[model samples]
Target: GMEFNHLTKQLNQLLAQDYVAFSITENPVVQMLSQASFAQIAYVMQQYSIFPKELVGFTELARRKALGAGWNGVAQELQENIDEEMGSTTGGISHYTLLADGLEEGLGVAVKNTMPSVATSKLLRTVLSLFDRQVDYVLGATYAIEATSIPELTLIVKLVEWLHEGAIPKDLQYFFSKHLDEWIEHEAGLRTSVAAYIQPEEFGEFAAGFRAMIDAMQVWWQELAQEAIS
Candidate 1:
């Protein structure tokens, strides 16, 4: 058990680097979006929107799991995050829709034309379903995923700004900006929540869940990036 505690501690440190480990924001397809036409940008962003949309199912299932696991404290914040995703916060504009709106309004694209693909939605649903089976991995991977987002997205923000000549409209950039500012505290809170309930014996499950999610996300990101290129 002490071994698990120590290993989980080590796992946390490694999980912190997952964005770097499974990076896709900087891939040629994604980065090229900066130079592509606004239509291209909108199409790609719609593809990107698939995550938050899919994330709703993932987090909701995790919330239910948290309640069952007696981690109501974590579930409460998870609901808050879910609300933002589902548009309960931010004046009824779901974060993903907000990004889509920005692309349409600011970048002048027909967002409806860039809808979530059937294949993509299927893949996303499968991924969400995988995490629903266990709460430890559910919340553990969720925390790790959110934790790495700031650093991972910051680079893309810079690229978009440069592409827009430093004129990325406030609305278009809002999601990335909010996450970069807020997710650090969110990640910390998640770590605290996990520490309170995660037994040393359960550490392996947590770490495995985190890694499984990260690995799945790596594939997801890669596929999305290729979608952009295609």
Candidate 2:
């Protein structure tokens, strides 16, 4: 049996090339990101890393919940990804974990101090307050971020490849292989959750916050890449 592996690689490369070549890309997310500054990009990466670290457990739990709710084998794969990701590092090697932990704690203070709207609102506050309580925060944020990470990871692979090892071990190549699937599915799920959660009145706030996060991130990444650039 002739596997379609080569054809698949060709397809992926063509798509990546097309985006860079003609700028014919349809992904609004990436277009929006094009506007971010270097510092903002770093902020974005930190947020992204922290976000996944926080939600990994919830992702697995949700996969199980989705399975319990009839989500099937796909969900099972997601669960495996979560497990392998956590198992990748701990203790001394968990310096990134320490960084994420530091961000989470420091940001918790900032989120509380600066944003009284989400903090005071009964519903949103209740949802967010569940952040550290075992599996709850993990589950809620999972639907939002895994939605973002999958394609983000794909683009990450491309970026790393483009950098030619400047961004070493970024494709989960050395970390966890199982986390590599379902990019589009995660994005779709997130959009669905955003639609479902953003009530008619809350639409403006929800959209604003979501957009701000992306803006904040671009500033973060541009700065980091400057130092890492060859």
Candidate 3:
């Protein structure tokens, strides 16, 4: 019980630090995007196009681990989330498609041929490695991701609105509208699952994975900010 409390406390502390570091008002990338031109924003979006695919990979890896560990509920939830991400639950148009379409239609930029920047690739690799480790590590990294996405996606929504001068099209708004709510639900579910499943002995590796993800994300954002301003 003490270990559970310690893990939760550490996670909360990390979440607090992430909230401040990646907040809409404080993140360097968001600050740069606030002053950036439309084309610059589009460039950042292109760089981000690599993420949704990696997200699916990460979730699948975790799902396999959950299945192997007999965490049926966690496995089921992961499958459902993958379905949603791939848009099987929504109409067969994946979130990646929505983002690409949004960039093309909303920002008038082509994302079809875009490739990940060096930093983006590095971030993707880091995420995959974290998830590919033990199941407890997956739980830690997943918790960090789901919890932080609320603010991160909120910042995206705000940036999109500001960039459009307040008139983003419905199709372009679809990705965030669907995701913002889903992430809230996912975060709550993940908190419960992490508590129920993670063992006391696993807390150290869990915390390490959690902090690793947070650090990787901060580096990714910093690199994006440099790109945007330079």
Candidate 4:
């Protein structure tokens, strides 16, 4: 149907943005990055990380709405399960505050740029899910921004080992590592359940919403870059 095409088109646009060649060197984390490989991590954090945050935000909103419709038991439990094991927005707001401040103190550029994204994310999370509007934005935000893991993370550990001779911290890795794990699984799971999640004509509306978001984001991204340049 038109919805599938439209959704694919939006996906392609995201993929194109995915393709956009931005320098990870611009990321605040770059100064700390010892090698170019880690620079790609900077890029992912800066741009693509938004996808995971947004998707999680959508999941949270969807769950909350489901709860409102009397879905708290299983729906919320699923959210909790993923969150507890991986972590959840359950305490996200407080944590980001500390994180921003922590980065500001530890890595100035990281904090400087993250400040705006975090603020906008809080505001924008309202629309992260069309199905529900009340879930805590702290749980997840639906947008993109640059970021990276600390030195000692598993993959990051391997990355640093290969790139920087293992200088990154084990505990200070990315704040949302659980998010990474959950998002990969979630995207895969969604592919299998899109039929039910979208449900007939509803899929079209969902796709349209996604398209609208992309258009809005493209404009915003340009403006953001321009203002930074100006």
Candidate 5:
């Protein structure tokens, strides 16, 4: 129904607001990291080491939801994302390992020894709870992350360049660059899947879920910014 389109538009608008709220250019954490010393930047990167675990958990929840809904197409799309994240597309070299290796090599940070910050842990719990909701809500939260990640990753890439005064080495560059190249298609697939799977009656729940996830992310950044300052 046309209502799906309406929901999509509404969600996109919400995303616009969310994007501005934590934009790379304006986000305190980003600014902090941009001007940070190598050790400080490495510390933040260590906190971010939880990303692989987060992605795997959330995407698996989404996949299970899609399977339960019997939305094979949605499941397939999500499966592809999962596979890529797990590095099935990159000769079994999971993105987590790539990022860890990059951190160790480029930043001299041992990712394995680093733990998530309080903010990171809270953000993970909030996101997992959001994904654990109804299917519409799950997809809505999924869309929120998927759509916003392009700009998010772009900011990270810029941060790296700013930190080094130019491009990082090839090994350190792959994780960010590869995701930037691929996330466009991933976002599109998720947008389409959200429209197809979300019923009109579920729009309220879906929109709420989207907003909640965005809020959680915003708070996470704010907290990280505080952590950076301390």
Candidate 6:
């Protein structure tokens, strides 16, 4: 185990490893998709909704776990935030319904029929595993991830606009807007929780978990791009 500040230093090393932006932009398939039609890009993007939908539940469970263990701090705040998000009309925290609305309007297909690919299925399964882990590790990995996601998220928004001549489909823009613009307001809470709760021995595991999740995300997007191009 390491001290909180020490753990943050190691996270800084891992954080710059650069998976998010490269995962999408550098992939030949994703490169091709960036120039494709709105319908096509929206289809690929819709696959992302499943993550936030399930993520709200994941965080909610982690909050409860922390509470059960008699530790309440960032986990509590995150859980409350997630609870509000989960109960919304937009299909959980990631707002799948809004993305679905974009899909239905742009792609001319039933949202329910737009199934996840095998890779998405794998990512979902991996997410399910987070529920079984200790809450601190889960939050730590999330802290590492959310901290590093700004550039990737902004690029994703720009890439979508690039596909459409600088204007995004309004229906789906909020999904990216909230993530790219609003997530940082929430980051301080996550970081505070990470510093307060994460144990020293768990630092390696925390960092490893963060890497695994990011790699999984890279694989998820790459596979989605593959399907979109196909």
Q: Best-fitting candidate, measured by TM-score?
A: 5
Q: Which digits, one per residue and each the tens of the lDDT, describe model 3 over residues 1-230?
A: 45675676777676676544467788776776647888787777777677765688888888898888887778888888888899986799888888878867886768788888888988988887788788887777877777677777776777677667877767877777777655657765766665677777788888887888888988897888787777
The CA lDDT of each predicted structure is: 0.65, 0.39, 0.76, 0.38, 0.75, 0.63
TM-score against truth, every candidate: 0.78, 0.36, 0.88, 0.46, 0.89, 0.76
- What lDDT tens digits, residue by residue, belong to model 5 across residues 32-71? 6636677666666677677665687789898999899887
**lDDT (Cα) of model 1:** 0.65
Model 2 clash tally, residue pairs: 19
What are the runs in model 2 whose C-alpha is more than 4 Å off? 1-147, 162-180, 191-197
What local lDDT does model 2 show for residue 136? 23
Candidate 3 residue 136 Cα shift, in angstroms, is 0.7
The better-scoring model by TM-score among 1 and 4 is 1
Which lDDT tens digits does candidate 6 get at residues 44-134? 6567556654666666766776787566776577775675565453445345555556646744544555567787899878866865677
- Candidate 4 lDDT, 22-105, residue by residue in tens: 223332233334434444443323442243334445556556654554534435444753464334453544333433443334
Which ten residues in a row are the worst by lDDT in model 6?
20-29
Candidate 2 lDDT by residue in tens digits, 1-230? 02222322343344345332113234332344456444343333443354344456545555665455354543655655564455533423342354344333433211112222211233233334433332222333443344344545565444333323334443235433434654455444434433332334443333333333333333333333332221
* Model 1: colliding residue pairs: none
Better of 2 and 3 by TM-score: 3
Model 5 sits at a Cα RMSD from the real structure of 2.2
Task: Give residue 125's lDDT in candidate 6 (0 to 100).
Answer: 86
Which residue runs of candidate 4 sit more than 4 Å off their true CA positions? 1-14, 17-60, 67-78, 81-98, 109-182, 190-194
lDDT tens per residue, model 1, 1-230 = 34544655676677555444334455544556645665555555566556655667777888889999898887887888787777775888777677667756766654445556654665576566667767776776776567556645764565456546777877766776676666657766667766767776676677777777666665655666566556
Global CA lDDT computed for model 2: 0.39
Clashing residue pairs in all predictions, respectively, total 0, 19, 0, 14, 0, 3
lDDT, residue 122, candidate 5: 97
